[PDB]
Each structure stands twice: as structure tokens, then as C-alpha cells.
Amino acid sequence: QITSCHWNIPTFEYRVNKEEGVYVLLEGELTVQDIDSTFCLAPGELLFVRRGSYVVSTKGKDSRILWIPLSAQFLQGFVQRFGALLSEVERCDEPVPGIIAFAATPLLAGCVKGLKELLVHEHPPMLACLKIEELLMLFAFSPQGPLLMSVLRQL
Amino acid sequence: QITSCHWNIPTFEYRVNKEEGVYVLLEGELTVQDIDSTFCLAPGELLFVRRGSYVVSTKGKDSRILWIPLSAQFLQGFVQRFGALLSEVERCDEPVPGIIAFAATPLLAGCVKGLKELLVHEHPPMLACLKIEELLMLFAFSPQGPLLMSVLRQL
């Protein structure tokens, strides 16, 4: 379900993500480009990406990255569980970018090191579901939360 | 709800916990004694304690510890959310100790550093609820999980 990704890409490739998701760069480099914009991120930064098509590249480096896909089912079972707190979030903007970048935060950093750790140590599967709810809940708490919220109504 | 605790106790005191809970020693020393047994724990070790009465001491040290109370309501709303996975856990033993100690594990360690971090950095309140579900889920996954499960039916 949630995948460590050893990628080497010197030029670029194309991705076509039928689901919303999260790209997080564990080791190496990773660029994500949509029609609008380009995002270059350090480890262990992440991006939230809408449904869509994307240009990805590693710059020919050896890169371990983490792809977390967010099913519609999960996203519902999430907003269901927490919809009351999420109604504290403001409404819109209405463009919603499609690639959403997040300011580096110690709590976000901790949530990332949680995912890393989950690859290396044996655990219950549901600990990952929880780690993602935590990440999502941090997004919704962020300044960029209303973006996510706007994406979250459409589906 | 969830409380940092600056305690200095040179001899001992008495606690009478109407709820199940978790004691985790952030800085200092902490002993927890029930009728059966005594537990001395390093930072950042923790204990799960049943409903009951306890002898606690700091050994006169300056001690920051964390008391996480687990309401019956929460414990239900927890077992509800995850009762299917918890039915993988074995049944009993039937004594259930009353103080449950857990082997030091990197994932448990990470869950503890998550709680620490939650004191210092601003966050949504529900991130703590999640951190506790994570800790609980690690207990149920542990060798000592059936103990917890046995406690969890009684209530």
C-alpha cells in the first residue's frame, strides 16, 4: 500500500496519479512539476499532490522516496472520523493548486521520521493508517489547510 | 487532559487512580508500586497502570513525568474503532497484573518522543488522541497485549 521507492531518473519521466497522494523525499533529490509550477524539495520535505499528471525527475541521483496514495475511500473514512474539527477550517481558495507544499515544521518533521521508522521496524499495519491521519491532520491545521479542505469536498 | 508533571518526592506518596492510565518518565526517576510488585523505570520508559491504588516516589529528585489518563469512554471509542484487529490478540491471562511494563522498543521510543514534542510545539488537540491510539495499538501488538485486552473486556 505505502511504498519505499528507489528511483534513478537523469532526465525526467511522467506520472499519472488517479488518486490524491503524498510524495516525501527520504534520500536524494526529487522534482515534481505540474502545468502551473515546479517544486524542488530537500529531504525530508514532502508534497501533497492532487489527482493529475506530473513531470518527475531525480536528476540522475540515487533516490529513495516514499509514495503515499490517498484513496477516496480512506479520504472519506478520514473526513468522517474528523469532519467536526475540520469544519473549523476556512473555506477555499477555489483554484486549489494541485501540488501543495508545506512549510518545514518540527511536528511535520516528526511525522516524517515516524514513516521512515515504520519501514525499518516491524509493526501493526494500522500504525501506518494512524501516521497518515496525523499527517493529514497537520495539513488541515496548517495555513494550507483550506486548500486541502477544498480538495476534500470535491471528491 | 494530558499533563506534564513536575514532581519532587523524597520518600513516597499515594495515588488512587479511578481510571486506567499511562505513566511515562520524561526526566528524573519514578517508582510505581502496587500490592504485588514494584517498577523502577528509566527515562523515557513507561508503564500502563490499571484502576487502583499505588505508591509513587521520585527519590527526592526533580522529575518531569507525563500522566496520560485513559477514560472508559475513550477506551470504548478506541476498541470500537479497532475491535476487529484486536480480535487477533490472544485471550488472557486472567490475573492481569495491574501495572504493565513494556520492553523498550524503537517504535515505543518514537511514540514517546512524539508526546514530548507535543508538549513543546503548537498542534491540534486531536494529534494527542492519535498519539495515544498509536501507543495503545503498540501495546496490543506487544507480547503483553493480551493483558491489555483482558483489562479491556472487563470495563
Author numbering:
A (entry chain A), B (entry chain A): 11 to 165
Sentences from the paper on this structure:
LC-MS analysis revealed that this proteolytic product encompasses the entire ExsA-NTD (amino acids 2–178). Despite low sequence similarity the overall fold of ExsA-NTD closely resembles those of the regulatory domains of AraC and ToxT. Overall, the fold of this domain is characterized by the formation of a beta barrel structure, which, in case of AraC and ToxT, houses the ligand binding pocket. The beta structure is flanked by two parallel carboxy-terminal helices α-2 and α-3. Our structural data suggest that L140, K141, E143, and L148, previously identified as critical for ExsA function, are all directly involved in ExsA dimerization.
The operons encoding genes of structural components of the secretion machinery and associated virulence factors are all under the control of the AraC-type transcriptional activator protein, ExsA. The ExsA protein consists of a ~100 amino acid carboxy-terminal domain (ExsA-CTD) and a ~170 amino acid amino-terminal domain (ExsA-NTD). The ExsA-NTD mediates homo-dimerization but is also target for ExsD binding.
